[PDB]
Structure formats: C-alpha cells, structure tokens
Amino acid sequence: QCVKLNDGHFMPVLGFGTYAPPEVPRSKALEVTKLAIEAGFRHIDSAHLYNNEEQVGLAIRSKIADGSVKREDIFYTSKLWSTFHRPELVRPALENSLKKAQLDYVDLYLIHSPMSLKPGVIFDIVDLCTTWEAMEKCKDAGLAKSIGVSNFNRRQLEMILNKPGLKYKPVCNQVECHPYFNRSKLLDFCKSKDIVLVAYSALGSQRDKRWVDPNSPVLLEDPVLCALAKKHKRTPALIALRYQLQRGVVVLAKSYNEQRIRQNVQVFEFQLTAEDMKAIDGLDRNLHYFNSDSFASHPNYPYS
Numbered sequence: 245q246c247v248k249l250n251d252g253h254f255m256p257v258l259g260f261g262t263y264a265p266p267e268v269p270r271s272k273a274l275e276v277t278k279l280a281i282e283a284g285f286r287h288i289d290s291a292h293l294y295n296n297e298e299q300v301g302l303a304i305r306s307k308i309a310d311g312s313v314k315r316e317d318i319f320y321t322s323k324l325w326s327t328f329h330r331p332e333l334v335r336p337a338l339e340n341s342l343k344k345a346q347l348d349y350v351d352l353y354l355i356h357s358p359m360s361l362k363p364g365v366i367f368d369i370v371d372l373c374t375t376w377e378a379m380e381k382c383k384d385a386g387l388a389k390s391i392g393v394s395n396f397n398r399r400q401l402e403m404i405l406n407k408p409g410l411k412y413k414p415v416c417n418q419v420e421c422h423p424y425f426n427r428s429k430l431l432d433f434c435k436s437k438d439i440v441l442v443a444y445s446a447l448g449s450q451r452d453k454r455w456v457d458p459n460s461p462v463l464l465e466d467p468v469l470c471a472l473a474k475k476h477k478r479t480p481a482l483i484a485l486r487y488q489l490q491r492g493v494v495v496l497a498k499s500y501n502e503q504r505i506r507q508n509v510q511v512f513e514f515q516l517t518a519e520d521m522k523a524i525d526g527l528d529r530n531l532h533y534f535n536s537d538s539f540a541s542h543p544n545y546p547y548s
C-alpha cells in the first residue's frame with residue numbers, strides 16, 4: 245500500500261532506514277539496500293548526515309539497471325542537514341545529494357531537524373520559514389517531487405502552515421515514534437492538516453551508546469509486544485511495525501541483516517485487533533531514545 249500525500253504524490257507506507265553508525269563499513273549500506281529492494285522495499289530513507297548516499301544510490305541504480313525495478317518504483321528520501329538551513333545553502337545541498345546518489349530527483353526532501361547549526365556543537369539562528377521557501381523552490385525546480393520536515397513539534401509545523409505566501413504544505417513530519425513514545429497528540433494534529441507522520445525508531449532505535457541511554461527500556465523486550473507476538477505467531481518487531489500501519493503512520497525500519505529485512509516486509513501479512521491496538525496504546529512512557537543533553541538548550545529544541 246501507498247498513502248496519497250497532500251501534493252498528490254504517493255508514498256509507500258513501509259520505508260527502509262539506511263542509517264548505520266560510522267564504524268559500519270560503507271559497503272554494507274550498498275549490500276543491504278539491494279537486499280531491501282529484493283525483499284520488497286520500495287521506500288528508501290537516506291540523508292546527507294548518514295554518509296551513505298553514494299552507496300544507497302548505487303544500490304538503487306544497480307537494481308534499475310539490471311531490470312529488477314524502474315526508477316519510478318523507488319521512493320527515495322534525502323534530508324537537508326542542519327548546517328545548510330540558511331536559504332542560499334538549501335538548493336546546493338540538494339544538488340550535492342543528487343550527485344552523490346547519481347539520481348535526477350529525490351521523491352522526498354526533508355528538513356532533517358529544526359535545530360539549525362553553524363554553516364561550514366555550534367548553534368545557528370535561522371528563520372525556518374526562509375529555509376522552507378528554498379525547500380519550495382527545489383520542488384518547483386523538479387529536483388524534489390515532495391518536500392517535508394522532520395523532528396518538528398506542533399508549534400514548528402504551525403510556523404510553516406501559517407507562513408504568509410506559503411505555496412506547499414509539508415507532506416510529512418518524520419519523528420521518533422514507537423509504542424514507548426507514540427506521538428498520539430502530534431499524529432492527530434498532523435492528521436488534521438493532511439500531513440503524514442513518518443515514524444523512525446519504530447523498533448526502539450539502534451541504541452547507539454553516543455545518543456541512547458543504555459538503561460532505557462528495550463522496546464522489543466517489552467512484555468506486551470512479546471505476548472502479542474506469541475499470540476499472532478509474529479515477532480515483537482512485526483507487532484511494533486504493524487501498530488504504526490494500523491494507526492495511519494508511515495513506518496521506517498532499519499535492518500542491516502538479510503533475514504530481518506525480509507521479515508519486516510511481512511508486516512502486511514497480518515492484522516492486530518482493536519483490543520491489541522489499545523494494549524499497545526497503553527505502553528507510552530514519553531521515552532525519547534535520542535537523548536539530547538547537548539541540544540536541549542537549542543531555541544528550536546522540539547521536545548521543550
């Protein structure tokens with residue numbers, strides 16, 4: 245299934261997360277993106293920050309050139325990093341992303357975070373309305389088929405939606421979302437504005453020691469998810485993915501393992517009951533896996 249975006253384009257509701265920590269050799273991003281496309285992934289989420297756009301792009305181009313898929317079948321996302329928020333830097337950043345991936349366009353270009361950074365942690369002060377205007381210019385130039393934001397709260401989304409002269413609403417807001425942090429309020433707000441919430445860390449994050457508290461609860465060990473996995477003869481990961489699909493959320497899933505990449509495409513093979521849905525709804529504990537002790541003082545910190 246795909247969801248119709250508010251600009252008329254369609255987004256597959258299951259996306260493949262490509263990010264890996266820098267101690268992961270860059271070859272792996274190439275090999276696994278190919279496996280993801282062979283497994284049935286069409287939505288691919290990359291970013292300038294990930295230092296993998298060349299490898300992810302080459303996997304997409306490899307699968308096109310061998311007849312597996314056509315460019316039209318692939319929904320490719322890149323993101324504008326926070327050091328490029330100043331409006332004159334936005335298009336060059338997208339163009340640079342296009343050359344690394346060797347693609348003519350991205351299906352979706354996002355503002356990675358509202359927390360602007362020094363162009364070149366050093367904060368910067370940018371009016372994100374001007375950043376969005378340059379976002380809109382890229383869509384009008386054909387370099388991005390759709391544009392959106394990421395890690396925005398409700399107030400930051402309102403800043404864009406109430407912008408005078410606004411030409412394109414953001415098609416999506418990609419935010420951390422999982423049973424332990426389910427974003428029900430923001431989902432309802434985005435739903436009311438025809439903005440698709442896209443969930444990252446839907447499986448509980450990669451728990452990287454540099455940003456995730458070691459003592460934070462492991463999402464996939466959660467007793468309710470494992471009991472539901474046993475009930476439906478699925479895995480705890482699949483229950484968490486299916487939860488987002490049935491609440492109208494487009495869900496990303498990162499795996500660099502061949503068997504788990506294929507497992508995640510079985511999210512379409514079963515359904516949760518309404519009672520199952522409410523049990524997962526009760527697991528929220530406002531848990532941000534991405535601890536931001538260095539960023540909580542940013543004027544645009546989205547969790548304040």
Ligand SMILES: NC(=O)c1ccc[n+]([C@@H]2O[C@H](COP(=O)([O-])OP(=O)(O)OC[C@H]3O[C@@H](n4cnc5c(N)ncnc54)[C@H](OP(=O)(O)O)[C@@H]3O)[C@@H](O)[C@H]2O)c1
Pocket residue numbers: 260261262263289290356357394395418419443444445446447448449450464479481482496497498499500501504505507508
């Ligand atoms: N806009 C933003 O600020 C932002 C922030 C974070 C992430 N993202 C993007 O969205 C993706 C979000 O995912 P994430 O990086 O936070 O990790 P994730 O999708 O929440 O998954 C976490 C871990 O689950 C494991 N996994 C995948 N399938 C599994 C399965 N059936 N069973 C058990 N474990 C499974 C993976 O380990 P294995 O690799 O070993 O399988 C993965 O490291 C990212 O890759 C990135 O593209 C965006």
